[PDB]
Amino acid sequence: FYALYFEIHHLVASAALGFARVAPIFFFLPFLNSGVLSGAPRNAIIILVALGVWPHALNEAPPFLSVAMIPLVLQEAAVGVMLGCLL
Amino acid sequence: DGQAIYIYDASEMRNAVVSLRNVSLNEFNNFLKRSGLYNKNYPLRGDNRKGTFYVSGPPVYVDMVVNAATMMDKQN
Amino acid sequence: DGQAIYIYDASEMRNAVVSLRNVSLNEFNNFLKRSGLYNKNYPLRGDNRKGTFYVSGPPVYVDMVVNAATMMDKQN
Amino acid sequence: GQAVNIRSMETDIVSLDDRLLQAFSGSAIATAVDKQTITNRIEDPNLVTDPKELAISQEMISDYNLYVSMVSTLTRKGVGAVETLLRS
Amino acid sequence: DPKELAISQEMISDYNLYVSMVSTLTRKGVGAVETLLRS
Amino acid sequence: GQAVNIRSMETDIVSLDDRLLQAFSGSAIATAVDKQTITNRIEDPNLVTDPKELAISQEMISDYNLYVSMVSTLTRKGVGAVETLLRS
Amino acid sequence: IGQAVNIRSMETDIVSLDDRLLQAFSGSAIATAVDKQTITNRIEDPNLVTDPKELAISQEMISDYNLYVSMVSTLTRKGVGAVETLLRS
Amino acid sequence: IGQAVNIRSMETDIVSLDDRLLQAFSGSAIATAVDKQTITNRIEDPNLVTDPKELAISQEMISDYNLYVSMVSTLTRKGVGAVETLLRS
Amino acid sequence: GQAVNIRDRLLQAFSGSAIATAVDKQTITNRIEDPNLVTDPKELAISQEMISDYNLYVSMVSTLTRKGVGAVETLLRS
Amino acid sequence: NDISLIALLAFSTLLPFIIASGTCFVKFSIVFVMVRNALGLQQIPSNMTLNGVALLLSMFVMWPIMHDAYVYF
Amino acid sequence: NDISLIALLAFSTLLPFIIASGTCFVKFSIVFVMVRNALGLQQIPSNMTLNGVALLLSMFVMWPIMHDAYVYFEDEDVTFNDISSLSKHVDEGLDGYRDYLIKYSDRELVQFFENAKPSIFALLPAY
Amino acid sequence: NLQTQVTEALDKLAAKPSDPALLAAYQSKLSEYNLYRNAQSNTVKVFKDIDAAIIQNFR
Amino acid sequence: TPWSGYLDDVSAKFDTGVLSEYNLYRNAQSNTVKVFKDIDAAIIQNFR
Amino acid sequence: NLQTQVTEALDKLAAKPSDPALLAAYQSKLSEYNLYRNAQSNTVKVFKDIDAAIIQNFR
Amino acid sequence: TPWSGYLDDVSAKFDTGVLSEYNLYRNAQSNTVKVFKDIDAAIIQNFR
Amino acid sequence: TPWSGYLDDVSAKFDTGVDNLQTQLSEYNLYRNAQSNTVKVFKDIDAAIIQNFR
Amino acid sequence: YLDDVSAKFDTGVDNLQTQVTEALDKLAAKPSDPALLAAYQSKLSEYNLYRNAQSNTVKVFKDIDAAIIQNFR
Amino acid sequence: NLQTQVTEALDKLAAKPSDPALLAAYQSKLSEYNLYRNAQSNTVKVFKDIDAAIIQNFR
Amino acid sequence: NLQTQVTEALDKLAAKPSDPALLAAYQSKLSEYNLYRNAQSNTVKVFKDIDAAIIQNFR
Amino acid sequence: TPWSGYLDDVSAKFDTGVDNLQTQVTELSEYNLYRNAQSNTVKVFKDIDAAIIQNFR
Amino acid sequence: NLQTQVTEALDKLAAKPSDPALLAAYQSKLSEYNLYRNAQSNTVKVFKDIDAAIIQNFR
Amino acid sequence: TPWSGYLDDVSAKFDTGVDNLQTQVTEALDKLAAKPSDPALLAAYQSKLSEYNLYRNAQSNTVKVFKDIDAAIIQNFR
Amino acid sequence: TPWSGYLDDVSAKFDTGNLYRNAQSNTVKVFKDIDAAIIQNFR
Known part of the structure; x- marks a missing residue:
């Protein structure tokens, strides 16, 4: 019974990179920014939106494991601010 | 006290009451008279052959009478 | 103390009262006269053949008399 | 004897909830009949x-004691993992 | 057992620390972009 | 034998910082001897x-522990009051 | 050995909200007060x-009182903390 | 071993809430000093x-002394915590 | 038979405390x-001490790093 | 039977993030920040109380939905 | 022993307000934004950066007096049996900082404030 | 219902406290009730402890 | 009113049953109450 | 009022410590007071600990 | 029907198996039941 | 003061209950067996409350 | 694992549980032989060592796993 | 001053370890000092615990 | 590899559960393995807790 | 230094309280109970302090 | 230096494990070292715990 | 290596303090069981079993006193 | 090597010193419980 804990545990790791991709669109959009949205239910929305759109299957292990993590965050933020300035 | 002169203001005088078990007041007054720590201005108030007495004086005289009185009953 | 001259100011004089069990004051004074640390300006105040006494002087003289009395009485 | 199904092929699921609901119903019926047996x-x-x-019943008491606490701290850590992300 | x-004792705890580490870096990651856009 | 020191020494203070500093030295000398005795x-x-x-060594622990725990939390509140007013 | 049970629960539509919580509170306070005497x-x-x-019965009832009031304590604590996380912001 | 009780609980007027709190503090510090010396x-x-x-009598006086000051501690703690959230706003 | 042998400051500080926690972890x-x-x-008993000063060491450099980087943000937002 | 309590407490811990996402509290909170912003007032009316007045209407609507869960479970 | 750790931890907590007020950082960060308002620009060069360049400069010159605080206090000669010499010991530890504030503060304002060798607590607003 | 046949064998030994077969059967009853009673007490205790541990974990 | 309990009752089964007849009489009567006394001490510990 | 008939049976065995019926009744008394006293001690304790658990939860 | 556990069955093996003969027949009998007693009294403390 | 307590009362109750049993063997054996038994009972029934204080 | 530390005592002896039953079958057959009393006391006293060394090793292994599981949290 | 009358009864039993009345009074003394010492130990502990609880609550 | 030489001593006592020297050495083995296992469990626990404290400080 | 604790002082009191009881049994219920209560009392003194060292923390 | 005279008294009892005065003195030694070791363990533990409480307060 | 610990130290310290008690009670079991009526043989093995029971309980309860202190340390680890 | 205990020595004083077999067989069980209860007072 170890895989049941591991299935939610691979998910909560996968949603962090999903947050890092889609978080700077919720700053850019005029009907979604912090001026129109509060603090308490904002971070509930941004996680489950990336959970409903994440491309790889959830029960599988993510390929993030110790490749290069601090520059990976600056990749996903740079493409996030790119998608923000296009949208 | 034979080696120095201490001076305090009047609002610092301390009081103490101490009861000895196995030595008398007249035997402790001989320890103050023979050693030279006797003081006629602030003597010891109490019955001469008993254990309970009353002291009041400078804070270096009171602490010396109490600490030299409670250190004789551990020896006698 | 036979080797150097310590100088303090007058508001640094400390004093103490100690009690010996199996060593007399006349024997401790004959030790201080045997060693040369006997100081006639700051002598020991107590009964000449008893166990309790009072000492007052410079802080290097008081801590010497206390540390040699409570290490001489424990040896005897 | 006993049974083992051999092929645990990953039946791909539309969300993780049907898996959680089947794991919860797979074990609630387990511990309910253990508490009777x-x-x-x-x-x-x-x-x-x-x-x-x-001593066989001593054994099954030690199994039932070790089981529910092994499910307890495993889910308390799973909830503790998901709230630190969702709190923010 | x-x-x-014991090997599953380390195996749960290190992967729990890894998921908290990857989530705290994402929070300081996008928060640095937020403050730099406010500048 | 025993030996007590009847004379306690005192020094004049002119400012406000030295009144704090003599409490600082009095607590560091209190904890340095009570950690050792x-x-x-x-x-x-x-x-x-x-x-x-x-039993006397039992209660000397509780005297040391409540004292150092008291001076920790009073200073935590004392710097918390300088913290909040300057943050505003 | 004497028992009694009431079977039909009172139930209707109240658009009023606080009196249902008052019935829940009094129904828990009386049931926890009768058993501390029993x-x-x-x-x-x-x-x-x-x-x-x-x-054998006496060890049972002290456990039934123990698990009951501890359950209400933890449910309420999560309840008042849930409203806290939304209003504190 | 021979006891006495006093039956008069006097009333002085409060001139403010500050005048009320000084009575509530002095009335509680005497009870917590006396029970510990008891x-x-x-x-x-x-x-x-x-x-x-x-x-079992001394057990009862112990458990009441623990529960009294713990109940006034958590209540004053939540009271000043209620002050801090309003002042932060 | 027993034997014995005998033998930017931040860039030396982090390297000095780098193996200082590693050899106490390994010993x-x-x-x-x-x-x-x-x-x-x-x-x-001496391993119990060896655990306890290990805990105080990395907690002290933890919180002192936290307050060290804690002093820069308030001045920089100003 | 015992792990039904684990499922209850684990549901209990994740409750206010469900109120953060699933219910209609998200309609009241946004329009109440918007009526503050359109008036030009920045800090007032002190949105800690505006969360509370927006919460009480959403509970006032959500109560018949959540009440049938208790009697069913 | 444990009074030294609470005193150092209190210094780490108070450290932003001391560098915000007590040291020479206020001479830097004021006159940096004075040039920006002299030129007439409002958000250029975006004073978050300019506080950075004022901080590395003020830390670069405050650090030598800070290095003196180690070599006086990391030694093992702190054991004084009488508490007043230990008090004057830590009086002489901060003496370089006090000498720096005396070097850069006006004289008569300090003695007006300690009217209420001078105390470090009194000259601090006068600096 | 073990306590019934506990409470039914003591009286015939009361009428005859010298029959050798009866005290053998009576001891075989009463020690067996000793084994039953602590079994019920020990078995309810774990069911309390694991039920208290979950709320101890989740509080 | 003198109250009676269960240990009185089990000793009341024994006391009404009546020289070697009288001294093997205190033989088993000592055994039964001492063995009945410890069976609840574990359970009365088992509240906590 | 249990302590009264506790304190009333010790004196007749004290005056006559050789009656076989009396020490049987005396032991039958003292073990029941043994069962009563720790029962009262164990029952006040749960009412204290669960009262401490609420303030432990809400603090 | 009376419920007969394993220790009732071993006493039934002593009874249904059939002065100095009959007394030592009890002498071996009064100890073997205490032996069967404390062996199961050894498992019971190990539940908690 | 020379303080006497309840265990001194119950242990002297064995001695002062009889007239001259301490001066005048099977009687004195069981009399010790009950005297030594009742103090093992009384030292336990309070000590359970002693551990039950905290 | 916990079945195997129990089953190593049922495997390590062949048929002792039946050897005691056939022994007491002979004891209830002819309860008057000295070699039969001595053989029964030699076969009966090995059983209480056997089962109490069966139940005590699983008792000490129970708390060892209980120390393992509680240090998860 | 309890330790004085503790320290005065052990020596007469040391000189005569066969007097039956003395070991009865000595056991009645020493178990009573046993009841006193852990009572003082358990009672200082709660006064520590509740004083520590206030700074744990207010910190 | 401690569990190997643990698991090599149980079988000779299984074949002979009456040797006095063997159960003395077996207890000398098993209590030392009891001291080893919880020591490793308690020592990994601090290395997890202090690793969780850094992210608790910096979050 | 040759060190003796208070427990050793109790056990030594059974050695200095007797005069020749250690010699005359070589030269029996007296030696039975004199060694019985000695071990029982040093067991009590072993136990009475052990609750207090736990009550330290 | 307590461990020296611990390690010097077990061997004469090892050579003679039937002397009544010696094993009495050995138990009087070894239980006293038992009282010493957990006392040292409990006293270093509080000096760790209150030192950990300061960083817990100030973090 | 066949490894030894401190608890194997104290147990084999009992086994090296004694020399031949594991076989000398077998030789008195050889002697007394040959003719089981001799008064110089009944007390011979009865003097061998007595020291065997005292020595085997002494090697046993020492183990528990040297166990529970090391239990108290590891309980004081966290 | 002939190993000796002191329970081997009290047998040696009985050799070197039907009632002889009743005095020794009782005093050897005197030590068998006195020195067993002393080491049972360890725990």
Whole structure:
């Protein structure tokens, strides 16, 4: 019974990179920014939106494991601010 | 006290009451008279052959009478 | 103390009262006269053949008399 | 004897909830019949006077004690993992 | 079981620390972009 | 034998910082001796046997512990009041 | 051995909200007050404490009181913390 | 061993809420000082602690002393915590 | 028979505390993998000290790093 | 039977993030920040109380939905 | 022993307000934004950066007096049996900082404030 | 219902406290009730402890 | 009113049963109450 | 009022410590007071600990 | 029907198996039941 | 003061209950067996409350 | 694992549980032989060592796993 | 001052370890000192615990 | 590799559960393995807790 | 230094309280109970302090 | 230096494990070292715990 | 290596303090069981079993006192 | 090597010193419980 804990545990790791991709669109959009949205239910929305759109299957292990993590965050933020300035 | 002169203001005088078990007041007054720590201005108030007495004086005289009185009953 | 001259100011004089069990004051004074640390300006105040006494002087003289009395009485 | 199904092929699921609901129903019926199958073992007198049956029931008590606490801290850590992300 | 629980004892805890580490870096990651856009 | 020091020394203060600083030195000298005298009571193994001198060494821990815990949390509040007013 | 049960629960539509919570509060306070007496006069009665037949029941009721009030304590604490996380912002 | 009770609980007018709190503080510090000196004189008399009947009495005075000051501590803590959230706003 | 042998400041500080926590991690690691040292009481007491100052060390440089980087943000937002 | 309590407490811990996402509290909170912003007032009316007045209407609507869960479970 | 750790931890907590007020950082960060308002630009060069360049400069010159605080206090000669010499010991530890504030503060304002060798607590607003 | 046949064998030994077969059967009853009673007490205790541990974990 | 308990009752089964007849009489009567006394001490510990 | 008939049975065995019926009744008394006293001690304790658990939860 | 556990069955093996003969027949009998007693009294403390 | 307590009362109750049993063997054996038994009872029934204080 | 530390005592002896039963079958057959009393006391006293060394090793292994599981949290 | 009359009864039993009345009074003394010492130990502990609880609550 | 030489001593006592020297050496083995296992469990626990404290400080 | 604790002082009191009881049994219920209560009392003194060292923390 | 005279008294009892005065003195030694070791363990533990409480307060 | 611990130290310290009690009670079991009526043989093995029971309980309860202190340390680890 | 205990020595004083077999067989069980209860007072 170890895989049941591991299935939610691979998910909560996968949603962090999903947050890092889609978080700077919720700053850019005029009907979604912090001026129109509060603090308490904002971070509930941004996680489950990336959970409903994440491309790889959830029960599988993510390929993030110790490749290069601090520059990976600056990749996903740079493409996030790119998608923000296009949208 | 034979080696120095201490001076305090009047609002610092301390009081103490101490009861000895196995030595008398007249035997402790001989320890103050023979050693030279006797003081006629602030003597010891109490019955001469008993254990309970009353002291009041400078804070270096009171602490010396109490600490030299409670250190004789551990020896006698 | 036979080797150097310590100088303090007058508001640094400390004093103490100690009690010996199996060593007399006349024997401790004959030790201080045997060693040369006997100081006639700051002598020991107590009964000449008893166990309790009072000492007052410079802080290097008081801590010497206390540390040699409570290490001489424990040896005897 | 006992049964093992050999092919645990990953039946791909539309969300993780049907998997959680089947794991919860797979184990609630497990622990419900365990809580009876050791209690009725205690409640019959012929089961408890035999030392041979008695250390078997000592064994199943130690299994049932170790099981629910192994599910307990595993889910408390799973909830603790998901709230630190969702709090923000 | 004393060696299998011990190797699963490390195996749960290090992966729990890894998921908290990857989520705290994402929070300071996008928060640095937020403050730099406010400048 | 025993020996007490009847004369306590004092110095004049003119400002406000030295009044804090003599409390700083009085607490550092209080904790430096009370960390040591209970360890000397523990290291002398005749003192660790009698229940009388066990009970006085029992309560000397609680006197040390409540004192240092009190001066920690008072300073935590004291700097918290400088923190919040300057944050505004 | 004396028992009694009431079967039909009172139920209707109230658009009023607080009186249902008042009935929930009084229904829990009375049921936790009758049992603290029932366990206490079982323990001060010196006939019930000596019988091994009655003692098996006596260990049960102290556990049923123990698990019940601890359950309400943890449910309410998560309840008042849930409103706290939304209003504190 | 021969006791006495006083029956008059006087009333002085409060001139403010500050005048009310000084009575509530002085009325509670006496009760917490007296009960702790009661349990010390119960202990320091050694003939009271060797009898079986007086021990559950001292158990009761212990558990009341713990529950009283813990209930006033958490309540004053949540009170000033209620002040801090409003002042932060 | 027993034997014995005898023998930017931030860039030396982080390197100095780098192996200072590693050798104290490893010396209680092979203290506990050696089973002769975990059975003796007076070896257990000095390992209990060795754990406790290990905890105080990395907690002290933890919080002092936290307040060290804690002093820069308030001045920089100003 | 025992792990039904684990499922209850684990549901209990994740409750206010469900109120953060699933219910209609998200309609009241946004329009109440918008009526503050359109008036030009920045700090007032002190949105800690505006969360509370927006919460009480959403509970006032959500109560018949959540009440049938208790009697069913 | 444990009074030294609470005193150092209190210094780490108070450190932003001391560098915000007590040291020479206020001479830097004021006159940096004075040039921006002299030129007439409002958000250029975006004073978050300019506080950075004022901080590395003020830390670069405050650090030598800070290095003196180590070599006086990391030694083992702190054991004084009488508490007043230990008090004057830690008086002489901060003496370089006090000498720096005396070097850069006006004289008569300090003695007006300690009217209420001078105390470090009194000259701090006068600096 | 074990306590019934506990309470039915003591009286015939009361009428005859010298029959050798009866005290053998009576001891075989009463020690068996000793084995039953602590079994019920020990078995309810774990069911309390694991039920208290979950709320101890989740509080 | 003198109260009676269960240990009185089991000793009341024994006391009404009546020289070697009288001294093997206190033989088993000592055994039964001492063995009945410890069976609840574990359970009365088992509240906590 | 249990302590009264506790304190009333010790004196007749004290005056006559050889009656076989009396020490049987005396032991039958003292073990029941043994069962009563720890029962009262164990029952006040749960009412204290669960009262401490609420303030432990809400603090 | 009376419920007969394993220790009732071993006493039934002593009874249904059939002065100095009959007394030592009890002498071996009064100890073997205490032996069967404390062996199951050894498992019971190990539940908790 | 020379303090006497309840265990001194119950242990002297064995001695002062009889007239001259201490001066005048099977009687004195069981009399010690009950005297030594009742203090083992009384030292336990209080000590359970002693551990039950905290 | 916990079945196997129990089953090593049922495997390590062949048929002792039946050897005691056939022994007491002979004891109830002819309860008057000295070699039969001595053989029964030699076969009966090995059983209480056997089962109490069966139940005590699983008792000490129970708390060892209980120390393992509680240090998860 | 309990330790004085503790320290005065052990020596007469040391000089005569066969007097039956003395070991009865000595056991009645020493178990009573046993009841006193842990009572003092348990009672200082709660006064520590509740004083520590206030700074744990207010910190 | 401690569990190997643990698991090599149980079988000779299984074949002979009456040797006095063997169960003395077996207890000398098993209590030392008891001291080893919880020591490793308690020591990994601090290395997890202090690793969780850094992210608790910096979050 | 040759060190003796208070427990050793109790056990030594059974050695100095007797005069020749250690010699005359070589030269029996007296030696039975004199060694019985000695071990029982040193067991009590072993136990009475052990609750207090736990009550330290 | 307590461990020296611990390690010097077990061997004469090892050579003679039937002397009544010696094993009495050996138990009087070894239980006293038992009282010493957990006392040292409990006293270093509080000095760790209150030192950990300061960083717990100030973090 | 066949490894030894401190608890194996104290147990084999009992086994090296004694020399031949594991076989000398077998030789008195050889002697007394040959003719089981001799008064110089009944007390011979009865003097061998007595020291065997005292020595085997002495090697046993020492183990528990040297166990529980090391239990108290590891309980004081966290 | 002939190993000796002191329970081997009290047998040697009985050799070097039907009632002889009743005095020794009782005094050897005197030590068998006195020195067993002393080491049972360890725990």
